[PDB]
Amino acid sequence: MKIPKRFRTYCPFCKTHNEVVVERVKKGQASSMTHIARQKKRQEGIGNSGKFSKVPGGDKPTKRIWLRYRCTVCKKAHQRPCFRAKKFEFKE
């Protein structure tokens, strides 16, 4: 499915309808200084690690298209609950 790259919608911050650009959200790398990373390193020893020796699960048949809507005026983005599509493109 296609969505326009730019369309006019509501900005929650400026509280008006402005043009907004849609940007796909990329998942970031997990920090090594978060409390869960420190806990994993602390629970690392001899033997089973508990939840830190779990193997990651499966995947749903289609993931949601993680989109972020940045207002062109205030340059602030907001993200809304998103649809679930096999193939996603931007309408240009």
């Binding site: 020893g45 001899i46 033997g47 089973n48």
Partner: protein, 196 residues
């Protein structure tokens, strides 16, 4: 400055690999390896360390060099059921330090004496060496000495075996006061060994 020669001995042993003690170390380790487990010596190798630890040049005070192996608690893999946390033992070093092991072996060699203190005197890839100061509580010279006649009391017998030396108290978590000593003082056993 006017510093005592004990200060010069202390300085020489501060960074031993950078002083003349390195060559003495190279020559001495051959002799020390030739020796056994618990060797008596006429004088302490490091006189200043022994004197600050309580050594005196008098009858009833014995100094011994003890040889202890390196690494942690040489442990056997269990041959019955364990839960994978108690199965692994290679990385499990003990809770008994090498210095306190040396003190207890010295005490075992000398049943009539009491361990006073000990200090590090060398090490190589396979051994560490400590010199242990021992006192004869039944010698009249020690009995007269008012800085040492406390060792003639009934509670001073078996000091090293009950963790009452400086190394033992370091191993019991009682080297400091305040925070972190909740489960260590007055004893490890008093808190169900949860400290240490």
């Amino acid at each position: 400055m006017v510093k005592s020669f004990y200060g010069y001995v202390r300085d020489a042993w501060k960074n031993p690999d950078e002083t003349y003690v390195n060559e003495l170390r190279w020559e001495r380790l051959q002799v020390w390896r030739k020796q056994g487990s618990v060797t008596r010596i006429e004088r302490p190798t490091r006189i200043d360390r022994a004197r600050s630890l309580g050594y005196k040049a008098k009858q009833g005070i014995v100094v011994v060099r003890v040889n202890v192996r390196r690494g942690g608690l040489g442990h056997v893999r269990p041959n019955r059921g364990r839960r994978t946390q108690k199965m692994g033992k290679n990385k499990v070093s003990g809770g008994m330090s090498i210095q306190r092991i040396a003190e207890v072996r010295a005490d075992r060699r000398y049943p009539n004496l009491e361990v006073l203190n000990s200090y590090w005197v060398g090490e190589d890839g396979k051994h560490k060496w400590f010199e242990v100061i021992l006192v004869d509580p039944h010698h009249p010279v020690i009995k007269s000495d008012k800085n040492l006649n406390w060792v003639c009391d009934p509670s001073s017998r078996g000091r090293a075996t009950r963790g009452k030396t400086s190394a033992g108290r370091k191993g019991r978590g009682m080297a400091t006061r305040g925070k972190g000593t909740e489960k260590t003082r007055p004893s490890i056993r008093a808190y169900k060994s949860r400290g240490k």
